[PDB]
Amino acid sequence: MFENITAAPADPILGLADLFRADERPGKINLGIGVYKDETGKTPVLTSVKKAEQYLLENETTKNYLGIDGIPEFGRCTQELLFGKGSALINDKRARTAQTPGGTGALRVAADFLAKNTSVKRVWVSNPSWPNHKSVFNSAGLEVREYAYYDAENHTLDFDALINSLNEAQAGDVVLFHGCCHNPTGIDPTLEQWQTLAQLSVEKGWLPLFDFAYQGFARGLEEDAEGLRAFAAMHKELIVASSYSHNFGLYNERVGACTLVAADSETVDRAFSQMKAAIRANYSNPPAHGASVVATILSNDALRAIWEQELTDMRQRIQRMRQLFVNTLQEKGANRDFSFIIKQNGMFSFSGLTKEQVLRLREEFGVYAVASGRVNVAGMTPDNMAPLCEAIVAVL
Amino acid sequence: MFENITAAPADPILGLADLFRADERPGKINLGIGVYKDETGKTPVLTSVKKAEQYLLENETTKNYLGIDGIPEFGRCTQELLFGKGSALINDKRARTAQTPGGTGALRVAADFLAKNTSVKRVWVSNPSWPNHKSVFNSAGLEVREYAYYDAENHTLDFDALINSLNEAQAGDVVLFHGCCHNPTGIDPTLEQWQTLAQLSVEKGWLPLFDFAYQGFARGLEEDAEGLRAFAAMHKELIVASSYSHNFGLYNERVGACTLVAADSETVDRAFSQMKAAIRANYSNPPAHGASVVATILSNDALRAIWEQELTDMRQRIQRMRQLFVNTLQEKGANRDFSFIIKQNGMFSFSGLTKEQVLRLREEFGVYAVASGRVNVAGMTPDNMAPLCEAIVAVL
Numbered sequence: 001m002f003e004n005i006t007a008a009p010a011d012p013i014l015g016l017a018d019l020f021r022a023d024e025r026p027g028k029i030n031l032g033i034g035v036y037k038d039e040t041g042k043t044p045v046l047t048s049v050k051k052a053e054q055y056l057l058e059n060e061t062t063k064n065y066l067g068i069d070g071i072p073e074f075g076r077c078t079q080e081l082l083f084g085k086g087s088a089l090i091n092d093k094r095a096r097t098a099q100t101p102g103g104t105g106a107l108r109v110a111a112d113f114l115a116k117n118t119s120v121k122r123v124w125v126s127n128p129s130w131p132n133h134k135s136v137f138n139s140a141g142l143e144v145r146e147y148a149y150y151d152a153e154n155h156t157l158d159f160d161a162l163i164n165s166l167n168e169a170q171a172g173d174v175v176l177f178h179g180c181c182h183n184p185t186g187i188d189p190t191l192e193q194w195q196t197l198a199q200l201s202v203e204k205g206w207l208p209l210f211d212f213a214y215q216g217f218a219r220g221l222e223e224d225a226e227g228l229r230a231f232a233a234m235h236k237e238l239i240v241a242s243s244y245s246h247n248f249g250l251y252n253e254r255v256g257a258c259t260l261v262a263a264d265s266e267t268v269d270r271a272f273s274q275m276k277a278a279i280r281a282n283y284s285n286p287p288a289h290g291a292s293v294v295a296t297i298l299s300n301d302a303l304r305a306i307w308e309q310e311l312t313d314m315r316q317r318i319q320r321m322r323q324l325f326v327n328t329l330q331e332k333g334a335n336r337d338f339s340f341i342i343k344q345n346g347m348f349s350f351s352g353l354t355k356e357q358v359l360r361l362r363e364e365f366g367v368y369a370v371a372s373g374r375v376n377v378a379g380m381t382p383d384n385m386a387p388l389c390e391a392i393v394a395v396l
Numbered sequence: 397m398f399e400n401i402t403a404a405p406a407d408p409i410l411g412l413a414d415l416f417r418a419d420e421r422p423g424k425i426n427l428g429i430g431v432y433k434d435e436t437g438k439t440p441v442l443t444s445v446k447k448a449e450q451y452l453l454e455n456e457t458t459k460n461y462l463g464i465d466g467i468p469e470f471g472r473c474t475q476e477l478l479f480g481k482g483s484a485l486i487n488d489k490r491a492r493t494a495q496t497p498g499g500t501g502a503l504r505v506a507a508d509f510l511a512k513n514t515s516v517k518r519v520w521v522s523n524p525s526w527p528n529h530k531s532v533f534n535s536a537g538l539e540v541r542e543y544a545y546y547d548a549e550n551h552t553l554d555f556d557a558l559i560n561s562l563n564e565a566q567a568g569d570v571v572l573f574h575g576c577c578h579n580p581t582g583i584d585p586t587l588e589q590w591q592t593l594a595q596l597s598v599e600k601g602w603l604p605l606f607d608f609a610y611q612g613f614a615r616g617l618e619e620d621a622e623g624l625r626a627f628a629a630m631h632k633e634l635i636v637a638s639s640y641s642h643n644f645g646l647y648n649e650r651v652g653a654c655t656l657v658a659a660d661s662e663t664v665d666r667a668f669s670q671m672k673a674a675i676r677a678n679y680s681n682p683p684a685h686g687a688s689v690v691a692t693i694l695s696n697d698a699l700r701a702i703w704e705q706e707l708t709d710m711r712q713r714i715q716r717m718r719q720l721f722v723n724t725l726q727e728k729g730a731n732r733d734f735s736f737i738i739k740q741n742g743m744f745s746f747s748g749l750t751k752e753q754v755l756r757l758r759e760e761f762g763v764y765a766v767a768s769g770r771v772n773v774a775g776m777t778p779d780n781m782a783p784l785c786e787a788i789v790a791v792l
């Protein structure tokens with residue numbers, strides 16, 4: 001049966017790690033990572049998270065299955081985090097949240113629900129986007145189309161091209177929006193541009209799908225949701241796939257949510273029963289540990305206070321590294337203006353390097369970046385900043 | 397979109413649960429549960445699991461992503477549990493294991509791998525089987541056909557009718573086998589029958605898919621894989637979906653595995669890359685806590701000794717209840733012969749009640765069982781045994 005199964009290509013983010021590990025050169029730097037890293041080069045367990053795990057160790061009396069949709073307060077809490085504490089969507093019971101294995105899992109559940117219960121045939125993703133986007137929608141049997149987004153010349157959101165590619169793009173098509181900290185560009189719409197897109201979205205009959213993987217990493221917990229919130233005000237229907245992998249450092253516990261909103265309560269319950277039937281035929285019911293940690297933090301005000309500070313420090317570390325990257329570049333002799341880096345948000349940016357400059361830094365120097373020129377600013381430390389910058393000045 | 401989504405039909409097993417917590421009238425017995433309960437009626441955390449979780453609290457320094465296929469050690473220990481300590485499959489490197497979200501998640505990733513990389517169009521499951529088998533194979537786009545299994549009259553394995561229905565199965569079809577503790581029947585093949593089914597499988601060209609959700613609950617760890625191991629001896633290729641939800645009490649942490657064996661290592665390496673591509677497009681990589689707990693216990697001889705003892709006592713509790721149920725039925729005055737309960741394995745048996753006898757049992761009060769007649773013997777305690785048997789005698 002398996003004799004003539006072909007190999008499956010190297011994953012563009014994952015494949016680079018092996019290459020790295022296996023290189024065993026001295027002062028090598030990996031900017032191809034997809035995880036926050038602190039000043040010392042590591043990805044620690046948050047203190048709030050370790051305190052909430054001690055609590056669970058002492059209080060759990062059973063590991064009996066969660067409901068198909070998970071922990072209830074996990075769902076109340078992510079609804080307030082996404083839509084704000086007094087949202088009409090919450091008071092009018094127009095939203096339903098299922099706990100899922102990570103943001104990727106929420107995205108696959110949304111895709112299987114849409115494919116099996118709806119007329120959606122196509123989803124529009126930005127060019128560029130996180131490459132596993134195309135694979136979850138394609139696995140569910142959905143066509144993915146690309147809209148323009150980025151200006152390589154100016155390192156900006158070329159809004160006009162985005163709006164023009166989103167023409168025609170039929171009523172009943174899904175448009176996927178990154179809520180904040182665009183991966184791979186770090187270029188986000190302004191609140192005026194989000195409000196325009198929201199208006200255009202209801203004029204055109206699109207179904208907005210927000211991918212929210214990085215809330216809290218651009219400007220703040222509430223600021224980062226204004227885009228979503230501008231759509232949620234004008235739309236009857238909406239889907240949000242969020243992750244708690246980054247803002248809680250819970251990467252391997254698979255903590256995310258898939259939120260469904262419909263015009264009203266009765267319609268969200270009918271549509272959410274089919275979302276649950278899609279979960280049941282995939283993994284049945286969700287991972288409890290990671291999500292229990294999130295519900296314990298978010299609901300205990302001491303713990304939450306400490307988590308918010310831990311998140312603020314992760315956000316400020318990335319902003320320091322963005323200023324220090326372009327300053328050191330100007331100092332070591334960089335030939336080009338790289339100030340756009342300071343404008344961009346979260347852990348990713350396109351460095352503005354050629355595929356051949358990205359192989360030059362791997363081969364010659366210790367520097368590892370994704371072929372696209374995407375670097376992760378959290379991989380830079382005040383310590384490796386000068387050898388990294390000398391190496392890219394050398395390939396400019 | 398969503399305006400006219402129809403409600404999903406209530407899940408047979410899970411739908412009874414809410415009717416149960418809505419009754420709240422006094423000495424209600426729920427025998428429709430899918431989990432082990434002890435003499436208290438509780439589903440405890442194993443103390444071996446509490447001990448391994450504290451070790452993880454003290455020793456984890458990161459929650460950074462696992463590989464797509466999960467924890468290594470977890471994979472090796474799963475293969476020795478399944479295939480035995482020195483099996484040629486492990487020494488020839490013919491097997492590859494991916495850590496998965498539960499036994500249901502393993503079934504779904506085997507199903508997407510099979511639907512996307514293979515000529516399989518059908519899977520044969522027994523009649524009866526766990527209701528969710530049809531649904532995960534169907535969500536992957538696979539046809540499920542049914543082979544005969546149970547003898548309603550004699551309460552046995554109708555072997556002649558199973559061989560016969562399986563002659564309709566073509567080469568390149570996957571046949572699904574419950575490894576031990578058949579759900580809902582609890583009727584398992586003898587080793588002589590397993591060996592028959594293996595030989596016949598080799599010459600007719602079936603692809604074996606074993607679902608092993610209860611290893612250790614009928615006889616013992618090794619005794620329970622005896623059937624798997626007869627197929628593994630003569631087959632080039634096979635797939636095993638296993639769960640650690642029941643023998644470890646790790647239900648809501650979603651701990652299972654999917655094992656691929658092929659003719660040789662380079663073939664299973666090429667096919668396993670396609671399996672990992674299917675995982676990546678589903679939930680990206682697996683939940684760490686539960687599998688970390690399984691690998692810690694299995695790795696350490698002290699913890700593994702305590703676990704084996706905890707599994708022994710669960711297995712002996714089910715066996716005592718099977719005995720005490722047919723004895724109490726006898727002395728409470730049952731006019732049917734329930735001897736067959738003693739012969740069956742693990743938590744489930746068909747009681748041999750009609751649809752209208754289980755409805756009246758429930759309404760005329762107390763006892764909740766699946767419409768099918770399926771009873772979970774671990775929901776019976778020495779305390780509720782006589783009123784339960786009272787009510788069953790009352791309806792024959």
Ligand SMILES: Cc1ncc(COP(=O)(O)O)c(CN)c1O
Binds near residue numbers: 244
């Ligand atoms: C845009 C985007 N969406 C979804 C995800 C997935 O999140 P998770 O790690 O929980 O799968 C990522 C990766 N972190 C992402 O960058």
Ligand SMILES: Cc1ncc(COP(=O)(O)O)c(CN)c1O
Binds near residue numbers: 574609639
């Ligand atoms: C036969 C069978 N297979 C698979 C599963 C699923 O196991 P899990 O809960 O780990 O997904 C079950 C349910 N426990 C089952 O009874």
